[PDB]
Amino acid sequence: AIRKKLVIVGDGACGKTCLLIVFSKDQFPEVYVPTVFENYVADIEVDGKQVELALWDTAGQEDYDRLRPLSYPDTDVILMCFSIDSPDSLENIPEKWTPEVKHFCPNVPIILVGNKKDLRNDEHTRRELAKMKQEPVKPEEGRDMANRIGAFGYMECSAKTKDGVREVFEMATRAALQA
Amino acid sequence: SMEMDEKDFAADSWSLAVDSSFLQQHKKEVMKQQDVIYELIQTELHHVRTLKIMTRLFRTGMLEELHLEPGVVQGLFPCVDELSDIHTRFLSQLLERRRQALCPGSTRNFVIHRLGDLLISQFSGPSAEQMCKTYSEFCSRHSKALKLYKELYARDKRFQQFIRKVTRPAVLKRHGVQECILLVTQRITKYPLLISRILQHSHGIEEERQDLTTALGLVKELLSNVDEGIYQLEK
Ligand SMILES: COc1ccccc1NC(C)=O
Numbered sequence: 001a002i003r004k005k006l007v008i009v010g011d012g013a014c015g016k017t018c019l020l021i022v023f024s025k026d027q028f029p030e031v032y033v034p035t036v037f038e039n040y041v042a043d044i045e046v047d048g049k050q051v052e053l054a055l056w057d058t059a060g061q062e063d064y065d066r067l068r069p070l071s072y073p074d075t076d077v078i079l080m081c082f083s084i085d086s087p088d089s090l091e092n093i094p095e096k097w098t099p100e101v102k103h104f105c106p107n108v109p110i111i112l113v114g115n116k117k118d119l120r121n122d123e124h125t126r127r128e129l130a131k132m133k134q135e136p137v138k139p140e141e142g143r144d145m146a147n148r149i150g151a152f153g154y155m156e157c158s159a160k161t162k163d164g165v166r167e168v169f170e171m172a173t174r175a176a177l178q179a
Numbered sequence: 180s181m182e183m184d185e186k187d188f189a190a191d192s193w194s195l196a197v198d199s200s201f202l203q204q205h206k207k208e209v210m211k212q213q214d215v216i217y218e219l220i221q222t223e224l225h226h227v228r229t230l231k232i233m234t235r236l237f238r239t240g241m242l243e244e245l246h247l248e249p250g251v252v253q254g255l256f257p258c259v260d261e262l263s264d265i266h267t268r269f270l271s272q273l274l275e276r277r278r279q280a281l282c283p284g285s286t287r288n289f290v291i292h293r294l295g296d297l298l299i300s301q302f303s304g305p306s307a308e309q310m311c312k313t314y315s316e317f318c319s320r321h322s323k324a325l326k327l328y329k330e331l332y333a334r335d336k337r338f339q340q341f342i343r344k345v346t347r348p349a350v351l352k353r354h355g356v357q358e359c360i361l362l363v364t365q366r367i368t369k370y371p372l373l374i375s376r377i378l379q380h381s382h383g384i385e386e387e388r389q390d391l392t393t394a395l396g397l398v399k400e401l402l403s404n405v406d407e408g409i410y411q412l413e414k
Binding site for chain 1: 371
């Protein structure tokens with residue numbers, strides 16, 4: 001059992017806390033969704049390899065530029081998150097998050113993850129975005145960003161419905177194992 | 180940690196901690212506010228348990244079982260006694276406010292109506308100054324502690340044996356030396372997240388909405404000075 005470190009990064013309401021919670025939680029938060037995530041060490045078996053995957057969040061660190069980098073030492077895979085109901089959080093991926101992640105974590109694989117994919121066909125989300133002269137992030141827009149930033153890959157998930165969550169974390173384990 | 184508090188905070192939420200017949204007598208907004216206050220106390224109890232693993236298990240274990248060079252244990256666990264004192268006093272105050280709120284004849288049914296005053300006292304005056312000075316020091320010595328841990332594990336065989344042995348229990352799966360340091364560094368940035376969600380369900384008493392707003396501003400002020408005070412030291 002090898003130990004690997006995962007850190008999830010991204011803007012305020014990209015759903016990174018919900019994603020970590022839904023994955024680590026045996027069951028689904030039916031009664032209360034916790035405000036914060038402390039840490040978690042997952043036992044993942046991907047492609048026959050048994051790995052111990054430590055999971056970390058950067059929620060709350062977004063405004064503190066000297067505190068946030070303390071989350072980065074020894075990271076083996078970065079989940080770079082954005083929200084599909086927020087095309088503004090995709091614009092900040094290459095401008096703000098990628099220069100930081102590559103400076104502090106050079107040669108660490110990044111998976112670009114589009115969260116909240118369920119809101120792509122939600123009526124209230126499409127109405128609110130139309131007032132802003134916008135629409136939900138299209139799959140090809142996410143792939144074009146992953147390509148432009150040199151990401152290991154692009155993935156989509158929904159923490160609300162659990163669709164795609166297990167695949168994101170197994171792929172992150174595979175990316176962490178490669179040397 | 181003590182069994183009494185471990186059971187009082189064992190449930191996934193306040194709605195599951197209290198009796199179902201007690202829960203049913205409250206307005207949904209009270210249940211929602213209480214759920215977040217319970218999470219603040221639950222995570223503070225976990226934070227203090229983390230600092231006790233660092234002081235009693237790792238720090239003290241290394242002194243009593245290893246012939247490590249002087250000052251190396253200090254470099255591994257910076258300001259942990261100061262941090263242990265600050266958060267244990269804070270936890271003591273949150274736990275007593277919960278006990279005060281208990282229904283007579285019950286050890287689980289409570290509703291905390293006042294919290295903001297306790298949060299204002301903690302994040303203001305001499306107490307906030309002490310946390311500011313302590314977290315600025317801890318965070319500036321954080322990278323050097325991880326590097327020093329890694330050197331000791333790569334060069335000393337007895338240090339490897341000590342770590343393998345103390346971290347064997349399953350209850351310590353997410354609490355190794357490096358995990359404990361990151362858990363401590365990340366603690367201070369959780370407070371605004373927890374206090375803002377508490378404030379969002381506290382518009383029933385105006386003195387409470389104002390108290391929770393004063394405390395939210397006080398925590399953000401603190402984090403900004405802790406961030407400004409960081410100056411990473413090297414091995
Ligand atoms: C009156 O509300 C309750 C319902 C069930 C059990 C106990 C109580 N009350 C206390 C104070 O515990």
